[PDB]
Design a protein around this ligand. Structure first.
Ligand code: MG
Ligand code: ZN
Ligand code: ZN
Ligand code: ZN
Length: 646
């Protein structure tokens, strides 16, 4: 049984910090309890010759420890020391150093406020002093990343809440999102416009050496070029990051598996499940047994695949956007190793009903029976599965809130009330479908969604101060395209409604730099309001929320921006609660399910829970509410259909 890549243990950290130890300051120290696992395995069985370490014959002292049954390094497969192992290399515009001198060059660069690329366990990071405004502005400039929050590595967890420290210090060593007020040392460009910062602890020997020396917070963000997957080879890091890093601290131990840092909230809520969790299998819910080998492809964004068999499922690491340049290489290596580990050969493939997906094209190429699952069905089913809802558990009413997923009959969904079981999804209602003006541009430019909302719902929309920029434009050409259905498909998208409101409030740039940016801004703004008496509502007309009434009341309720943002979250939750309550009570359903990336919104969760105290409420916690949990939902649905003899 292989275990996830594990944070350097206290015993290895002590050995590395003890002068006179053969492994004193050795940046590759590991033992049977810690070190890289999944990221250094070429093939099963887990044995040095089938790892990245086959290239490094052990010296006699290492070999004795590896063979000694009582030694902490007994069969530590990637074991090494300075004599026989990998070593550091420094590269910087015609400078070169090795070993300790390489480390020191990287340290000197970081202190002067430069950016260094650092080789990690599962890829490379870009690092700089997180207190240094200039360094962080430079990193943002070079990476064309003006807003997206940067992960920061702290030397210690001191000063953080108990819950954060506990998560930070596990073998998994995730990034943990923490209120930025706990970390005043960070410059303001770490998470601009947001209330939280992703903090992490050193969890490999190199990181410990760096933070021990530096004693300050360090930006520790993914070493990628935008639109590409992270580099895993030195040669790819050097190419990809040349415009960005001032120098490169690399080494000659290969990484074979892309494995990003995991990301959780302090509350324990899973956002991205990679390093430290993969490749642990999970038990399927009660009633799922003897399941055939099923490969589930997930969806195109925030991708994970899932292998289902027997009574367990195993999810891949996060693979990101499947449209990125050469992402198939990493996706396929992950699939090869995962199938090798679990001796798995699929008999069935499951993928999303969206016919334009890359993953769906990959599924067509496998020579296996294929079946599709609706995106929002899979969201709801992943949440059910996580909560161990039995195979014969009964129907729930589900609320699935996201950006875009293909619904029934070619409709674009994103804000739906559904009657769900593992085998069935019936659409009951939700948000009205509203045009996406300019198609893919709608997700990048919030004003487009405000325009689309106003055209549909707001008489004399041009007269409100909140629509001024849109009104000033020649918006009428777009209005014409919307009318004629020219690259303006209808979507009942909760994400785009967020964007429209954010556009009206001016709390995001006119053009976004990352997906979800306007919605994150709006949530961060609403979060500073502790609740307010307000008249804004979203009534229900049939089984849809009445946005005409919402816009009329919201646009005409002047108040501080945070309270306007709060009132929107509150009205949206109340409106969806009323829909779900009617649907569930009249079917004798007592349990409600929530999923989709928008359900990551804390305030919405809280308002929903507030309004729905008369129901058992199921929210995602150990898998992402977003597309990262989707493959699991596809897998339980396929399994349930198979178990029913369909
Ligand atoms: Mg503090
Ligand atoms: Zn160890
Ligand atoms: Zn050795
Ligand atoms: Zn989704």
């Amino acid at each position: 049984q292989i275990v996830p890549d594990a944070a350097t243990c206290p015993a290895c950290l002590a050995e590395m910090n003890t002068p006179g130890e053969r492994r004193y300051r050795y940046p590759f120290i590991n033992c049977t309890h810690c070190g890289p696992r999944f990221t250094i395995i070429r093939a099963m069985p887990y044995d040095r010759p089938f790892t990245v370490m086959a290239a490094f014959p052990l010296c006699p002292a290492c070999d004795k420890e590896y063979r000694d049954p009582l030694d902490r390094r007994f069969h530590a497969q990637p074991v090494a020391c300075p004599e026989c192992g990998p070593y550091l290399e420094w590269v910087s515009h015609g400078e070169h150093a090795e070993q300790e001198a390489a480390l020191q060059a990287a340290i000197a660069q970081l202190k002067m406020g430069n950016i260094v690329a650092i080789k990690g366990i599962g890829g490379f990071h870009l690092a700089c002093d997180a207190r240094n405004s200039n360094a962080v502005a430079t990193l943002r400039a070079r990476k064309h990343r003006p807003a997206k929050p940067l992960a920061v590595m702290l030397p210690v967890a001191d000063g953080l809440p108990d819950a954060a420290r506990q998560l930070l210090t596990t073998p998994a060593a995730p990034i943990v999102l923490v209120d930025k007020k706990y970390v005043p040392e960070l410059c303001d460009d770490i998470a601009p416009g947001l209330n939280e910062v992703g903090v992490m602890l050193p969890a490999n020997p190199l990181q410990h050496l760096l933070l021990q020396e530096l004693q300050c917070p360090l930006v520790m963000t993914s070493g990628n070029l935008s639109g590409k997957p992270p580099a895993i080879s030195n040669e790819q890091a050097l190419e990809d990051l040349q415009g960005i890093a001032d120098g490169f601290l690399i080494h000659n131990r290969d990484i074979v598996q892309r494995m990003d840092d995991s990301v959780v909230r302090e509350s324990g809520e899973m956002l991205r499940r990679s390093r430290g969790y993969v490749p642990d299998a999970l038990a399927l819910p009660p009633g799922f047994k003897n399941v055939p080998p099923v490969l589930c492809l997930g969806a195109d964004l925030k991708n994970t695949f899932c292998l289902v068999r027997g009574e367990q499922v195993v999810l891949s690491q996060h693979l990101g956007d499947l449209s990125d340049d050469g992402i198939q290489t990493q996706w396929r290596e992950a699939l090869r190793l995962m199938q090798n580990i679990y001796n798995f050969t699929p008999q069935y493939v499951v993928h999303d009903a969206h016919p334009g997906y890359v993953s769906c094209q990959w599924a067509s190429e496998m020579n296996l029976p294929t079946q599709t699952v609706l995106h929002h069905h899979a969201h709801a089913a992943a949440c059910l599965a996580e909560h161990q809802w039995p195979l014969d558990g009964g129907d729930v009413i589900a609320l699935t809130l996201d950006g875009i997923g293909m619904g029934e009959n070619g409709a674009l969904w994103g804000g739906e009330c559904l009657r769900v079981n593992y085998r069935e999804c019936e659409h009951l209602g939700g948000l009205p479908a509203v045009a996406l003006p300019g198609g893919d541009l709608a997700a990048k430019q919030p004003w487009r969604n405000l325009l689309a909302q106003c055209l549909r719902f707001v008489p004399e929309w041009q007269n409100y101060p909140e629509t001024a920029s849109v009104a000033a434009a020649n918006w009428s050409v777009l209005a014409r395209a919307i009318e004629r259905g020219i690259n303006a498909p209808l979507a009942s998208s909760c994400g785009r409604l967020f964007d429209a409101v954010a556009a009206a409030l001016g709390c995001a740039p006119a053009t976004l730099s990352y997906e979800g940016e306007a919605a994150c801004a709006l949530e961060a703004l609403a979060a500073s309001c502790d609740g307010v008496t307000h008249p804004v509502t979203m009534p229900r007309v049939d089984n849809q929320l009445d946005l005409a009434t919402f816009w009329q009341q919201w646009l005409n309720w002047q108040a501080p921006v945070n309270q306007r943002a709060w009132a929107f979250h509150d009205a949206l939750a109340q409106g969806f609660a009323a829909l779900m309550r009617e649907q569930a009570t009249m079917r004798g359903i007592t349990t409600l399910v929530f999923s989709g990336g928008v359900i990551h919104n804390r305030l919405l969760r809280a308002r929903l829970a507030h309004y729905l105290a008369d129901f058992t409420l199921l929210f995602p916690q150990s898998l992402p509410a977003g597309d990262g949990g989707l493959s699991l939902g596809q897998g339980v649905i396929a399994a349930a259909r198979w178990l029913a003899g369909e």
